[PDB]
Design an enzyme around this catalytic site. Structure first.
Site, PDB file in Angstrom:
ATOM      1  N   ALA B  42      27.291  21.676   0.717  1.00 27.83           N
ATOM      2  CA  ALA B  42      28.584  20.795   1.469  1.00 27.83           C
ATOM      3  C   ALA B  42      28.686  21.006   2.669  1.00 27.83           C
ATOM      4  CB  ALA B  42      29.574  22.602   0.591  1.00 27.83           C
ATOM      5  N   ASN B  43      28.040  21.979   2.941  1.00 27.81           N
ATOM      6  CA  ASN B  43      28.555  21.977   4.814  1.00 27.81           C
ATOM      7  C   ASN B  43      27.569  20.429   5.076  1.00 27.81           C
ATOM      8  OD1 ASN B  43      29.717  24.353   4.788  1.00 27.81           O
ATOM      9  ND2 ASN B  43      27.585  25.312   5.528  1.00 27.81           N
ATOM     10  N   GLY B 229      23.172  24.452  12.402  1.00 29.65           N
ATOM     11  CA  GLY B 229      22.446  23.642  11.631  1.00 29.65           C
ATOM     12  C   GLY B 229      22.672  22.729  10.585  1.00 29.65           C
ATOM     13  N   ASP B 230      23.280  23.253   9.594  1.00 29.53           N
ATOM     14  CA  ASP B 230      23.676  22.303   9.204  1.00 29.53           C
ATOM     15  C   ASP B 230      25.160  20.937   9.486  1.00 29.53           C
ATOM     16  OD1 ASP B 230      23.383  23.506   6.624  1.00 29.53           O
ATOM     17  OD2 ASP B 230      25.254  24.690   6.152  1.00 29.53           O
ATOM     18  N   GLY B 269      33.330  30.304  12.995  1.00 33.67           N
ATOM     19  CA  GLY B 269      33.751  29.569  11.458  1.00 33.67           C
ATOM     20  C   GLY B 269      32.758  29.007  10.741  1.00 33.67           C
TER      21      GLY B 269
HETATM   22  O1  LIG Z   1      24.137  26.681   6.602  1.00 32.72           O
HETATM   23  C1  LIG Z   1      25.118  28.085   6.543  1.00 32.72           C
HETATM   24  C2  LIG Z   1      25.794  28.247   5.060  1.00 32.72           C
HETATM   25  O2  LIG Z   1      24.048  28.841   4.347  1.00 32.72           O
HETATM   26  C3  LIG Z   1      24.255  29.297   3.551  1.00 32.72           C
HETATM   27  O3  LIG Z   1      24.212  28.755   2.282  1.00 32.72           O
HETATM   28  C4  LIG Z   1      25.811  30.039   3.500  1.00 32.72           C
HETATM   29  O4  LIG Z   1      27.087  29.486   2.287  1.00 32.72           O
HETATM   30  C5  LIG Z   1      26.898  28.851   4.614  1.00 32.72           C
HETATM   31  O5  LIG Z   1      27.695  28.240   4.573  1.00 32.72           O
HETATM   32 MG   LIG Z   2      30.233  27.295  14.218  1.00 35.69          MG
END
Ligand SMILES: OC[C@H]1O[C@H](O)[C@H](O)[C@@H]1O
Ligand SMILES: [Mg+2]
Ligand SMILES: Nc1ncnc2c1ncn2[C@@H]1O[C@H](COP(=O)(O)OP(=O)(O)O)[C@@H](O)[C@H]1O
Ligand SMILES: [Mg+2]
Lengths: 287, 287
Positions: B42-43, B229-230, B269
């Protein structure tokens, strides 16, 4: 039936089983997550109700799905909830991580518990007020003042330990009964009329107006001692005589609380380990 | 606009701020707790969408109240959900802990994400497939094989480490781009065409067909590294050229991903920290 008002905390316990805790910058996958209702106030309310008291719980719930599970747990255990509050944001939450070497690592947020405000009408016509230190001390103190007005016993479980000493002085001064383990007792600013010190396997000891004495617990083979302290406190509240009471009635309460605490070690988990009044009687008959 | 398909996980995140990360056996009181939609997949989808890609997410939601909030988070960020599924039982839950140095740990109970099976048209009409390893590796692998047949870029965030070795070897054999921190990169079976190893504040190291080099990030005072990282991965996906690609286009993607990752650390966040495309541009202009 005795009437008990519990003013205190409620939390969802999230138990994760893992190989190892994640390291800085690392993501780890848990083998499992199990959600169980908990919190000192909720656990003590449940124990009081199971032990035969008519119980009203005043505590604060969040706006998350956890809050509905917490309310459901209490309602199912016959704990009254008309005097509770709902606050925006998460419910109190405890994360318990159990790793491959069976260490338990615990992370706690007060969440909604930090926004608990007093409900003095909750203490009206109660015999005992029971409170703990996982809610704002100003709220505990106001509840104790209400209990004083209503001629209800002020019973404080001095837990968790490590609270600021000066912050506890007014509450210590107003408490009739304080329940604490040995470590917790050292952090309590001054002795009450009735000081009840729990001693794990050995039961409890008392120092106060009635004298100085040991109260043995029944011998049992523990499975899980977690939650036993909350059972002791709730059962003590359910059995403590309304004012002015007598030494015989307080001794009976102590014996019953010690016996209930022992029984609680026979069951896994914290939320469902409270015995019924009938089981307490039997455990005492058996000595 | 590039068409990015993200096949991956979606979790509700409980983010706790502490002074120090808990050590085994410890009990720690958090300073704050938030409950927010996230999950690596999702991220990454949200970051790619904010960076200007046209994004589809393929993932498994639980059949629970959390899932409504998770879906709405994705819709609010222009991420398409027509290739998602509902699976019985809980949506994923993650625990994020952020300490005084802005370092973070992540613990995931994957819930529904662990039951994501290959969705037929999951990777229909995409330029870049981006996937991670909280979902079954065999599901990531199926998406990768479909994407590759359609000559889409196969991009894998190799996180978490330690997943199904045999499936990992099959995925590694065909990945075009792998994004991983140093520890995750060590665990990955075999090198991809383009190995992108993230280095926190130093940006990223590249090893592959273009040689061996480093790409710096803007210098910032960090607030919370969780989620960055995401952001890096989603922005990389949103900027990576079609195969076989040129070195200059790859370097530009790396620069933008490094800048976005840095910006992501300025915000508390996890799921809501991805910068807009114009913010990325502006941070690169300022160098
Ligand atoms: O990279 C952070 C994410 O890792 C895990 O999947 C958590 O849900 C978080 O949103
Ligand atoms: Mg942050
Ligand atoms: N091993 C045991 N055998 C018998 N009773 C016990 C045992 N452990 C605890 N108890 C009972 O529980 C009460 C509180 O015990 P404690 O160990 O403080 O609980 P907790 O593990 O919840 O802190 C004691 O006063 C006692 O009556
Ligand atoms: Mg127990």
């Amino acid at each position: 039936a005795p009437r008990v008002c519990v003013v205190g905390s409620v939390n969802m316990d999230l138990t994760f089983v893992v190989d190892a805790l994640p390291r800085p910058g690392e993501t780890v996958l848990a083998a499992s997550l199990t959600r169980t209702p908990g919190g000192k106030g909720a656990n003590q309310a449940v124990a009081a109700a199971r032990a035969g008291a008519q119980v009203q719980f005043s505590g604060a719930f969040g706006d998350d799905p956890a809050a509905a599970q917490l309310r459901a747990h209490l309602r199912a255990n016959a704990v009254g909830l008309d005097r509770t509050v709902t606050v925006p944001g998460p419910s109190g939450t405890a994360i318990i991580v159990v790793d491959a070497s069976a260490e338990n690592t615990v992370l706690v947020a007060p969440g909604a518990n930090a926004h608990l405000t007093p409900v003095p009408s909750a203490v009206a016509n109660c015999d005992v007020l029971l409170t703990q230190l996982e809610i704002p001390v100003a709220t505990a103190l106001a509840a104790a003042r209400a209990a004083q007005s209503a001629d209800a016993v002020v019973m404080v479980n001095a837990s968790p330990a490590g609270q600021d000493r000066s912050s506890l002085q007014d509450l210590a001064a107003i408490a009739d009964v304080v329940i604490a383990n040995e470590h917790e007792a050292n952090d309590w600013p001054s002795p009450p009329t009735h000081f009840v010190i729990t001693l794990g396997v050995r039961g409890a000891r008392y120092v106060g107006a009635d004298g100085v004495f040991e109260v043995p617990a029944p011998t049992v083979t523990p499975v899980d001692t977690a939650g036993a302290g909350d059972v002791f406190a709730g059962v003590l509240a359910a059995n403590w005589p309304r004012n002015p009471g007598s030494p015989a009635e307080r001794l009976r309460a102590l014996r019953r609380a010690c016996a209930a605490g022992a029984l609680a070690t026979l069951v896994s988990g914290v939320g469902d380990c409270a015995p019924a009044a009938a089981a307490i009687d039997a455990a005492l008959r058996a000595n």
